[PDB]
Write a protein that binds this ligand. Structure first.
Ligand SMILES: *SCCNC(=O)CCNC(=O)[C@H](O)C(C)(C)COP(=O)(O)OP(=O)(O)OC[C@H]1O[C@@H](n2cnc3c(N)ncnc32)[C@H](O)[C@@H]1OP(=O)(O)O
Ligand SMILES: *SCCNC(=O)CCNC(=O)[C@H](O)C(C)(C)COP(=O)(O)OP(=O)(O)OC[C@H]1O[C@@H](n2cnc3c(N)ncnc32)[C@H](O)[C@@H]1OP(=O)(O)O
Ligand SMILES: O=C([O-])C(=O)[O-]
Ligand SMILES: [Cl-]
Ligand SMILES: [Cl-]
Lengths: 427, 427
């Protein structure tokens, strides 16, 4: 049916990393119960609101397919309700600060006692055992810790944060792998396990190519395909040349390919007044004769100075800027169309507005309009993985404490004692 | 014991997205057999080599914990062998061009017939159903398609690619989620499924927050926390201050926080000569009194225009520029120390050099030294998820066709059958 039908998730998560994880689990069928702080709830509810006193898109786009119960966990009644909820859980997920769940009495060893089958899943800034394991980390600090900021941006500019969430959402997706892997062994062992993902580690995983380049740099003293190795091309703020005779750590490469097939961000008609009027253009080696046809340079097919990676490696930026002259009267889509004819790897910079309203993305269920008959409908990113056997069924994000009574009734409590919980301000 | 012990993976993958997926499965215990092209194999082998005739770091860092068999798939004998291996496998992973696996005999339907239990998993550039479904895509082409490039970099500069592999390694990790979930649902149904991740979609999932902001911008006309909403701070092509008056698609915010928690990338001692001499300084909501003690300005603790987020939103760049001048005489670790005592979300930009040789990442198994007796030892990224019950054991990447005979013998083929295949140039 759905892969995670019948998986009960006890969801302590707030902000983006942990909530990304449990939402996606909900999309694949999981029964997700989100524990929130009394009164305020998850911080994302009040962050970046578009309508005063309505849960922000920060919350709703990260908390569909969930039920909400308010709970003070620093109370003896709270800790007992938790213990019951743990015993009915398949997976516990949390992204509090280091040691926070521990100080609430819920260490991994006490969890194993409560439920031998329950998996504990954590997001933390740094890994257990790291000198920095006790630090609290948000999105951009995480990008800085993992090598991404150092290797993103231009050579004459600062380290640059990525708009893609390398810290939060990426750690949550990585945590989902750990959880599903724990489920795979549990079928063998009949036991739960602790799984943790550090935000620094998740970033380092996406920056595997830069660790490749660090070693290449150490071993050979040069990265020939980098802009800093191109003849008289890269310079710092004072006009000093930037070259590898001076570079001991992977530099920022601007819009360079990043791997074995050179590329660049090329202006298309309208770039002066439209921030996204660009294509990315890749010189794939198997594609060079086709590139020569497209740009009307037949003399470049048989020239050893042009017809191999090695020959072009000292003239990359010359070739890119000449190719770019061909795009001056064409918008990004017609350039993309034109290259597509030759089979050349080329594509548009898609604007957020263009993606938000693209028919193909809605048709495939990657951009989903959520039916929210309380707040009004909104877009979300759906499941990025498509399956032959099932489609996700995305339902609206809960109001704060909307399923508190519904959830307490599922624990076999009666109307009288649940009123005591509201009275004692535990719920 | 490891989660994926006894899971058999028939691995068609090449380049980066697919190999990352299968390597990481191999790290979790899976038996990975990699089909490669005769003579040249996976194209990463001869890309960005540091030594002539030695498999590159591009190949070894994406291909540990795998065996190699050479195979010409478009021969009758190749298709015959492929059919035998499909019946042994639990998971088939591929990232060929659109329809390429179909064209050599093996459609999803034909695969089901061969093995009702096998899961087909694919990385594509665009989702099946998409208008751009036909397009072959590389790393940065996907980053542009998925909205990352449009929202990364500066307002006065071009769309900017991320050093992090949002297209390749990220889609591969997303595909691993899809495979594992298909393994969960196979415990019920007793049948395999087809699963696919589009590179555009994996990129989009990490820019969920930018789709949040797109709706915020369409709904309200402004994004208050963005630099373009700051009084006389950012400027345009000629000199005019920017505003959201004429911005209808999510813009580039430079080093802005990207969320409800503000931030900026601040210079440290030696920034002129060291590109990574920087910290990121976040201003969390509750952590405000801690910050006021450091800046040598206790005026802001009571000041109505400084103690609220709605009060701070109109002078964000005034505060960041001043606290930068304090850091002029301290390096990035001293600045982070000067702030860790307050639990302030400040962190250093870590260089690739620092990360490759950091003691903590090695201790926790995130940067791993692979024992490679053929080529020499190299570094790699290990498993970014940490488990209580096991630890990955990372073994060197195979030589081309290193295991061909060994793999062929496992299918019960005699020495004569093997030598016939070598002579006929099938293997
Ligand atoms: S997506 C980017 C966010 N980063 C991460 O997910 C990385 C891991 N998380 C963290 O480092 C922090 O949790 C972040 C998200 C940075 C936020 O830090 P805060 O300091 O604002 O919040 P904490 O999680 O550290 O929680 C503080 C204390 O409050 C207690 N608490 C939470 N919820 C409840 C409820 N419902 N009832 C009672 N107490 C509750 C936490 O246990 C924590 O306890 P302490 O003992 O005081 O630390
Ligand atoms: S980091 C992520 C990179 N990109 C992706 O993973 C996205 C999906 N893959 C692709 O878009 C392409 O595979 C890319 C990476 C762009 C490479 O393009 P190629 O020009 O190399 O095209 P193919 O990889 O699909 O290969 C071309 C033909 O060769 C056949 N083939 C592969 N391997 C063999 C072996 N061993 N034996 C015989 N034939 C083989 C493919 O089936 C394909 O067939 P055609 O029918 O000719 O297209
Ligand atoms: O990064 C890439 O994909 C490249 O360079 O081809
Ligand atoms: Cl996020
Ligand atoms: Cl990659």
């Amino acid at each position: 049916t759905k892969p995670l039908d019948g998986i009960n998730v006890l969801d302590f998560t707030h902000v983006a990393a942990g909530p990304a994880c449990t939402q996606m689990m909900g999309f694949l069928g999981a029964n997700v119960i989100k524990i929130e702080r009394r009164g305020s709830g998850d911080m994302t509810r009040g962050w970046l609101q578009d309508k005063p006193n309505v849960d922000s898109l920060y919350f709703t786009m990260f908390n569909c397919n969930k039920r909400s119960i308010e709970l003070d966990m620093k109370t003896p009644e709270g800790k007992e309700l938790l213990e019951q909820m743990i015993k009915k859980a398949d997976v516990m997920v949390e992204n509090f600060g280091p040691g926070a769940l521990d100080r609430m009495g819920f260490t991994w060893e006490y969890i194993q006692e409560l439920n031998p089958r329950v998996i504990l899943a954590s997001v933390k800034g740094y890994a257990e055992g790291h000198a920095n394991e006790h630090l609290k980390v948000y999105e951009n600090v995480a990008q800085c810790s993992g090598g991404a900021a150092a290797t993103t941006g231009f050579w004459d500019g600062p380290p640059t944060v990525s708009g893609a969430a390398l810290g939060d959402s990426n750690s949550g997706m990585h945590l989902m792998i750990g959880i599903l892997a724990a489920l795979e062994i549990r079928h063998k062992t009949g036991r739960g396990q602790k799984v943790a993902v550090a935000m620094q580690d998740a970033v380092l995983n996406l920056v595997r190519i830069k660790l490749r380049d660090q070693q290449r740099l150490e071993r050979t003293g040069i990265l020939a395909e980098y802009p800093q190795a191109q003849p008289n091309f890269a310079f710092d703020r004072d006009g000093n040349p930037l070259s590898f005779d001076n570079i001991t750590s992977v530099p920022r490469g601007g819009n360079a390919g990043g791997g074995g097939q050179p590329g660049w961000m090329l202006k298309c008609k309208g770039w002066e007044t439209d921030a996204d009027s660009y294509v990315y253009f890749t010189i794939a080696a198997n594609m060079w004769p086709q590139i020569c046809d497209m740009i009307d340079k037949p003399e470049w097919k048989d020239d050893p100075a042009y017809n191999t990676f090695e020959g072009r490696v000292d003239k990359l930026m010359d070739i890119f800027s000449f190719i770019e002259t061909k795009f001056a009267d064409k918008d990004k889509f017609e350039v993309t169309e034109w290259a597509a004819q030759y089979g050349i790897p080329c594509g548009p910079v898609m604007s957020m507005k263009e993606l938000a309203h693209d028919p193909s993305l809605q048709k495939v269920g990657t951009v989903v309009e959520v039916v929210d008959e309380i707040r009004g409908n909104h877009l979300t990113v759906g499941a990025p993985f498509k399956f032959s056997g099932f489609q996700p069924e995305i339902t609206r994000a809960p109001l704060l404490g909307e399923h508190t009574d519904e959830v307490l009734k599922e624990l076999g409590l009666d109307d009288a004692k649940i009123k005591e919980l509201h009275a004692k301000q535990v719920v």
